[PDB]
Design a protein around this ligand. Sequence first.
Ligand SMILES: Cc1ncc(COP(=O)(O)O)c(CN[C@@H](CO)C(=O)O)c1O
Ligand SMILES: Cc1ncc(COP(=O)(O)O)c(CN[C@@H](CO)C(=O)O)c1O
Ligand SMILES: [Cl-]
Lengths: 442, 442
Amino acid sequence: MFNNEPLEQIDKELHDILADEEKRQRETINLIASENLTNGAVRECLGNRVSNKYSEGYPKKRYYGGNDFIDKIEELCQKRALEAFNVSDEEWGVNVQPLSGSAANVQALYALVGVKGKIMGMHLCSGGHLTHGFFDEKKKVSITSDMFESKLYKCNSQGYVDLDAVREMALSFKPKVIICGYTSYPRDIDYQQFRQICDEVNAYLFADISHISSFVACNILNNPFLHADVVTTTTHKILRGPRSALIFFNKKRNPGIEQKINSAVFPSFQGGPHNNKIAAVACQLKEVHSPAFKEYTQQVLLNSKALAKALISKQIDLVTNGTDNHLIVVDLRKFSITGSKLQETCNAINVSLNKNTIPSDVDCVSPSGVRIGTPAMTTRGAKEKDMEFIADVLARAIKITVDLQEQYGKKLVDFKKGLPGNAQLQQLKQEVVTWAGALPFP
Amino acid sequence: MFNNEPLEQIDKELHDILADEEKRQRETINLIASENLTNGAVRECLGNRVSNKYSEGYPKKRYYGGNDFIDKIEELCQKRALEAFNVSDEEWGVNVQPLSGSAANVQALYALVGVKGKIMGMHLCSGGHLTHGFFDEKKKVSITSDMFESKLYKCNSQGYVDLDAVREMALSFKPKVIICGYTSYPRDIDYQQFRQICDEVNAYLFADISHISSFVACNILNNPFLHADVVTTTTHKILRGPRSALIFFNKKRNPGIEQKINSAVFPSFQGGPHNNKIAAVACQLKEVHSPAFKEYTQQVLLNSKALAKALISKQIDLVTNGTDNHLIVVDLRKFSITGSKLQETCNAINVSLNKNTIPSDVDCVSPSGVRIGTPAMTTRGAKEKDMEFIADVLARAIKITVDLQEQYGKKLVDFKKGLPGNAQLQQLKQEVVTWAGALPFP
Ligand SMILES: Cc1ncc(COP(=O)(O)O)c(CN[C@@H](CO)C(=O)O)c1O
Ligand SMILES: Cc1ncc(COP(=O)(O)O)c(CN[C@@H](CO)C(=O)O)c1O
Ligand SMILES: [Cl-]
């Protein structure tokens, strides 16, 4: 007593928009550092009937029965996860049930410190995430600033983690957890140095490696598992999995942490796990362990280095003057334009990027930079030689943005009016669409 | 630069378990009240590339661009949701971004009352949900008892909502929100009477209709939208959508509640939405509005009443002695066996049900009932005539549980040891599999 007909027939309206979205994705240079493209195998898992199943609890400890095949899945996932992050099932556990990055951070932080607990994270404007305790003046923007009491460290005017001010704030504030690993940070992290600070104050060490997860797994960047009490990561970014998150906890360093994490997740915050997510994560983590994926992650870095260099060769300033990873932040002051405008300009030419604040930006109102990343384009088969074109396209957009601001003024509402019809952008869009459209596409 | 080969080829290990799980679902009488089976179109949407997209924010108000086809999807979903629940976009708004029911309740409750705020909900043992403020003595089990201050009302010894005790409690406690709509409640709800109580104390009316959502959409049961400030529902249960949740808010009664709900969701709790969930909800909501779905929901009710009647004709007791909805709770005292045991016995015969407490149960240790529901079986084509067989299978299972408790004792560990190899269970399992395996299966 149901409808069997394909999505096409059952709902042609939705299939219209979905087919369109697919086409935009195919015909875009996607530089959103936090984006990637899933293969059909990860998407078969997301569309699998395994999500019919209520499975509150953990393997071998379910509230409901009929959960044998689900137990095997969740365990296959936890194993594949510990293997991928080169870490022993005797020193480290994983929780695979967090529905997304933000959920996973809220949960882990609660487990460690509880309500009213004291947390420290990098400010959003300096490259930290919302769930690292972000707040405005009096307005507690993130639950992590309201549920916990939080203080935000900044980067120095060069764009690097101000480790000294982290100390000067740590002793001042006496936190129970300090978070590192970031939303927009183009360099590697000194986990060791964060460990030093954390000991001095009896604090937990939280590493959110969501953006750099692959580097950590493939031993290309610093290992946080050597110093961290908890590591969290999303699975949809450089990891190239589904939209989901993982919580890692060092038991061999921390008393009953397995308990605190696993019950923060359920039943403190979540109910039924989404088993299709768990299935999809499992499938990707297998790929993650293959050396073919290490080949991919390397290519992500080589592309990022080549893009940084080529942008610099066109006299474009980069925050920290380069990259250690997948992510670049362009400082635009030199051209007297906002990241706000440049985003709008790149939208018109099917180039996906987003505005990003720079150290000298006081407010978050009109950021002077943009964040770009290479994982999605690397997935589509772009190599170093291809980074010059992307760099050139970006430089053309920067210049156009300069011209269009000279005609229509500084206020963004006005600027946007200059975008449609512009002969140049229409020509630049087609170059993009033609090169982007014909790239490998999972 | 990716692996394109089907899940079958790329990962044979996972495909095995998934095919197994699928076979288990086909060969099971699934009586889990909160479970259903999604059609192929809902699963195509869950497996769609729309989840490659970061879409933090709301339609026309995103942080990143390239979000035009996402915006159309989220709006097509919000529309279809208001339509389905027979409510106008001028009095009521929706948020379609909560990842699951628990997140949705935590989010809605914070939006209304904030940290340290006061909430009333039905106790779990009485039929309430974890996110309705659940706690043990000193042990804040659910975040909803920790980040809020919560007090729990019970049901009377007949199994009904003790509206009088709710008053006795509302005046003593003075909460900012009272929750109704339940995990395990076999009767309709007096929303009007909850409204009256909330007025007397200046509290919000929160209705979680996750279990009965379809009934409310098809004007088959009482309408909470008439009296409630906030209505939450999951989409994976009787609604028969994906694993996701909806938050409804009465703006034409409540100030800037549109803002308060929408920002509790993002950026307080969540980050990027899971657009594939949004897409899948959109698709199911279309189906929900069809009169064919009203037919299905009616059948759910008829089947449920037929099952209750048949159980009673075989001298089996039911809490409240019947049902108004999809859900029955069997009282087992009469037989001196637990729900815990019957669950285990029903597992052995591919009959999915879960244990459930009755009004006279002191603790959660060893509940004296089971909860069953009809949505899943109705989806698989079962009609009123078919309920007799299901009732008969349950009666035979109750009897076997009685015989096995007599042979192996009362402690559950010992009892389970009696299950494997039992000639009767193997015979009864086969009867189940034969009839279950050949039922329509989306
Ligand atoms: C470092 C970090 N950690 C967590 C998250 C949350 O992921 P969700 O699945 O969206 O909850 C993010 C998200 N980052 C976005 C911006 O918010 C991005 O585009 O980088 C993150 O960066
Ligand atoms: C009434 C009600 N509200 C919320 C939830 C939470 O849904 P999740 O999607 O699991 O977060 C439930 C869940 N119900 C389970 C038992 O907890 C069920 O089998 O009934 C719910 O009932
Ligand atoms: Cl999903």
